């Protein structure tokens, strides 16, 4: 996973990520979380990440590699299931998201 994005990679990456966002499950990770919505998110969490950041990210080709990519999609789900108890509809988000990524994930890496 340490080879260099080519312009193609991009590609693959930008369908991930709409790909993402467009899941039903997605909603609590598109944008940054409001400190109204978690009480004292920003107190807990040292790295917050969503995907519109990411989407910004990629759009400015912020990303060198693949590792990086799945560094900040790993961290929107860390975050999650940090912050919030097992048993919270965040936290099952954060599951049923995962594995979507794993799966698209696993696409794009063939
Ligand atoms: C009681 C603590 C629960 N913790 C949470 C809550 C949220 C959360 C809540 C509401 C939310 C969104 C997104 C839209 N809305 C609707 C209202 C949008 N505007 C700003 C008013 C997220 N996201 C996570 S998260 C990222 O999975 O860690 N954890």
Redesign the pocket.
């Known amino acids: 996973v340490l080879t260099p994005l080519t312009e193609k990679d991009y590609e693959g990456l930008k369908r991930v990520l709409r790909s993402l966002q467009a899941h039903k499950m997605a909603?609590?990770?598109?944008?940054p979380?409001?400190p109204?919505?978690?009480?004292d998110?920003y107190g807990v969490?040292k790295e917050?990440m969503?995907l519109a950041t990411m989407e910004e990210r990629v759009q400015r080709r912020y990303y060198e590699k693949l590792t990086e990519f799945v560094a900040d999609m790993t961290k929107?789900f860390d975050?999650?299931?940090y912050?919030?108890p097992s048993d919270?509809p965040?936290?099952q988000?954060?599951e049923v998201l995962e594995s979507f990524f794993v799966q698209k994930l696993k696409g794009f890496k063939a």
Request: glycine residues 0%; negative net charge.
């Open positions: 909603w609590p990770f598109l944008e979380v409001d109204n919505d978690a009480p998110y969490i917050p969503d929107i975050n999650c299931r912050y919030n919270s965040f936290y988000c954060a």
